Amino acid sequence: ASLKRFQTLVPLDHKQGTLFEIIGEPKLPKWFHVECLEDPKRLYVEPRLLEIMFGKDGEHIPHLESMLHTLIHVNVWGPERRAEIWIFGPPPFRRDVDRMLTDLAHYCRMKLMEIE
Amino acid sequence: SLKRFQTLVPLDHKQGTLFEIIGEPKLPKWFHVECLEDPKRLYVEPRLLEIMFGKDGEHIPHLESMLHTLIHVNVWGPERRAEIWIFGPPPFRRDVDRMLTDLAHYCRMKLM
């Protein structure tokens, strides 16, 4: 990616496109299976939404990950480029977590335009 | 955290499964009053509530918007179980029920 680094239970390196790698030797969550690292789902969001959706430095992401049983990885670049939220787990899960994050994004977008 | 927690649609908990919307709030597009006819209840130690949901439940409106489910928190003594009430349905192979008990589990552990 490029770096703002967001919090998560398992920090990953975004190597290239679909390739992610676990950084160092973290204690993994009981529900997390290394195999899920193979096919993550990506969804785009504008960058300014990231900290509204996930809190400052993505501080609420470990809670969300615990609730969803999917890893969340955030890649962010310039203000002019779309951010990428990458989601990791069983495909039956990645689909509905995808709708949840889209629904959350819709909400945060409305609040953004109201708080201004 | 308080005795009333935050939410998109503040409710009065009348008795058991019976709730009522307080006043005339603008409702979320995804929400319909008939949702209140499908409550599910979960129990939790009161101590976990502010860990799970933020001070005074300040994160609940985000959670509700993610889940498309209203969350009502009834709390009593620090002794007895708090009730979490949800008016669904779920967006995952995992019941909103299961996602919230799992959140509580994580928060129980992190509380050590």
Author numbering:
A (entry chain A): 2 to 117
B (entry chain B): 3 to 114
Copy the relevant paper text:
FILIA is a member of a recently identified oocyte/embryo expressed family whose members are characterized by an atypical KH domain. The SCMC contains a core formed by FLOPED, MATER, TLE6, and FILIA. FILIA is important in regulation of mitotic kinase activity and spindle assembly checkpoint activation, and contributes to chromosome stability, although the molecular basis for the relationship between its special localization and its unique function is not clear. In order to study the structural basis for its function, we expressed and crystallized the N-terminal domain of FILIA ranging from 1 to 124 amino acids (named FILIA-N hereafter).
